[PDB]
Design a protein around this ligand. Structure first.
Ligand SMILES: [Cl-]
Ligand SMILES: [Cl-]
Length: 263
């Protein structure tokens, strides 16, 4: 069964794996360590983007507003922000796009400053009925993934439920929900993670992330050919795998979870 299959992957890879497959309405279909805490790493950028879109929905932000920065704001991984820095800004829209599809860390920090910092993302999670997910630091130190530390964590089930609300539920405006979904489908960083374990015929959007101590995660929504809608969260710590094997591990978990998608 699912429990034994995932436990076998853990032992074989000397990894810790947390996974939740949920339906459109947030109900757990299959899970393993689904309520244990893992570091978000870059997966937090999905609900962050949703918070910024929600602020645009509410008239508190403009998609074309210029978020100003200089070279000192750059991060080691910030491919878009490095290109825009001579102009002195990225727009809210550019920062959302870049944070989601490239995982740009300076763009993410621009958004975190825009929303009022990590505590305001925690507040947003709480507002959605997510009692667990929390952001505490900005890039890059939110990635430390230290044992016993609850900063910057989620659980597979809480994140999957939160994502299902944003992607399939009524929380965002029709416009913002579409923008978020299409951005995630166009993610550039997830071709070898959850997507690689699902049929190519299915619509998939996702947000990846990696952390210290071998953390590598992905959260995806997908829609089957039959039109059945799901969210799959996969959180892993696999310190003895190399990066490509960590992606393959995620794909392997997705393949196992895929057998519980009914036609
Ligand atoms: Cl870069
Ligand atoms: Cl990695």
């Amino acid at each position: 069964d699912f429990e034994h299959a995932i436990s076998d992957l853990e032992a074989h890879n000397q990894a810790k794996i947390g996974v939740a497959l949920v339906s459109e309405n947030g109900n757990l279909i299959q899970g393993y360590r689904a309520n244990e805490r893992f570091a978000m790493c870059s997966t937090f950028k999905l609900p962050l983007a949703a918070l910024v879109l929600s602020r645009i929905d509410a008239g508190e932000e403009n998609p074309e507003r210029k978020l100003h920065y200089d070279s000192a704001f750059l991060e080691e991984y910030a491919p878009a922000a490095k290109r825009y820095v001579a102009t002195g800004y990225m727009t809210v829209t550019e920062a959302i796009q870049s944070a989601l599809q490239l995982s740009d860390n300076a763009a993410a920090n621009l958004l975190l400053k825009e929303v009022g910092g990590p505590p305001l993302l925690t507040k947003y999670f709480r507002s959605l009925g997510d009692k667990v997910s929390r952001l505490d630091r900005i890039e890059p130190t939110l990635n430390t993934n230290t044992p016993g530390d609850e900063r910057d964590t989620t659980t597979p089930m809480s994140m999957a439920q939160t994502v299902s609300k944003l992607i399939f539920g009524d929380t965002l405006t029709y416009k913002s929900k579409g923008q978020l979904r299409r951005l995630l489908i166009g993610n550039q960083t997830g071709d070898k993670t959850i997507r690689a374990g699902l049929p190519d015929s299915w619509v998939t959007g996702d947000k990846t992330g990696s952390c210290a101590n071998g953390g590598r995660n992905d959260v995806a929504f997908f829609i089957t050919t039959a039109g059945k809608k799901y969210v799959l969260s996969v959180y892993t710590n696999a310190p003895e795998l190399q990066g490509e094997e960590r992606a393959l591990l995620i794909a392997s978990v997705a393949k196992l979870a895929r057998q519980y998608v009914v036609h």
